[PDB]
Amino acid sequence: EAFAQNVLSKADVIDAICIFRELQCLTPRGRYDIRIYPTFLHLHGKTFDYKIPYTTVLRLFLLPHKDQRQMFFVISLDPPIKQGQTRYHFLILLFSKDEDISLTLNMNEEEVEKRFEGRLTKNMSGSLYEMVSRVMKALVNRKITVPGNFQGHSGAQCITCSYKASSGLLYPL
DNA sequence: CCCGCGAAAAAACCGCCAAGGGGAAAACACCCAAGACACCAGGCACGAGACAG
């Protein structure tokens, strides 16, 4: 804080709409902060960084976990973000239902009303996954797909099955 | 039906295979396995309980 104050005392600072710090990502793997912009999102990592325009997004999927304790937030990309010799077709995020948050936008009330048409507010609070879903919806306009009318025998909304030498969850959307 | 329907001499220009299907070698990528890098979250240590004792 002292260094920041010393910097501000000499600089003339004039941005991101909202910044989520450290969100459990599964594809790619690791903790990544997410900065929101009017036309894209900056996925900042401890080493690698990516920038996904909203024009590249195709679908947003919000799925529950088999144990009913976690939430999967999937973003379908196009073109896929590239990293050396690998291309990711989906951005997967993992959240916990008991992981709340309180966010405040970097905009004013009237500007938010004009931009998001009242879909968002200057200050919000609620579950982390709910907040991310609401923000991404208000940004992309695409509706977030949710599980259908399927309910497995174990009461879960998916089936545990293998695929390409790897276990995982299959959701009938 | 078969066969014939004059001796010839000179010149010129046009006629100059193309496809469908089978096979060989090559790359072209899928699948599988193993190593090395980023990192993150799980154990250890410490404070601060607090709650039975």
Query: Which tokens in the block code for residue A159?
Result: 């089936």
For strand B, give the nucleotides within 7 A of a protein CB: 31-33, 38-41
Q: What is the DSSP letter of A17?
A: S
CB of A164 under 7 A from strand B? Answer: yes
| Method by which the coordinates were obtained | cryo-EM
- Nucleotide nearest A24 (Cα, C1'): B40
All residues at 6 or more sequence positions from A15 whose CB lies less than 8 Å from its CB, including other chains: A106
3-state DSSP assignment of residue A27: strand
- Nucleotide nearest A48 (Cα, C1'): B38
Cβ atoms of A74 and A102 within 8 Å: the answer is no
Alpha helices in A52-147 (DSSP H): 109-116, 128-140
Residue A101: strand pairing partners: A126
Degrees (nearest 5) of the Cα angle A50, A88, A134?
65
CA–CA dist A151, A122 (Å, integer): 37
| Cis peptide, bond prior to residue A80, ω within 30 of zero | no
Query: Which tokens in the block code for residue A67?
Result: 């144990």
Q: Which residue is nearest to nucleotide B38 (CA to C1')?
A: A47
Query: Which tokens in the block code for residue A133?
Result: 């879903």
Residue A44: strand pairing partners: A33, A49
Instruction: Identify the CA nearest to A121 among candidates A133, A107, A132, A101.
Output: A107
Percent composition of chain A: helix, strand, coil (DSSP 3-state, to 5): 20, 45, 35
Residue A83: strand pairing partners: A86
Which amino acid, A26?
L
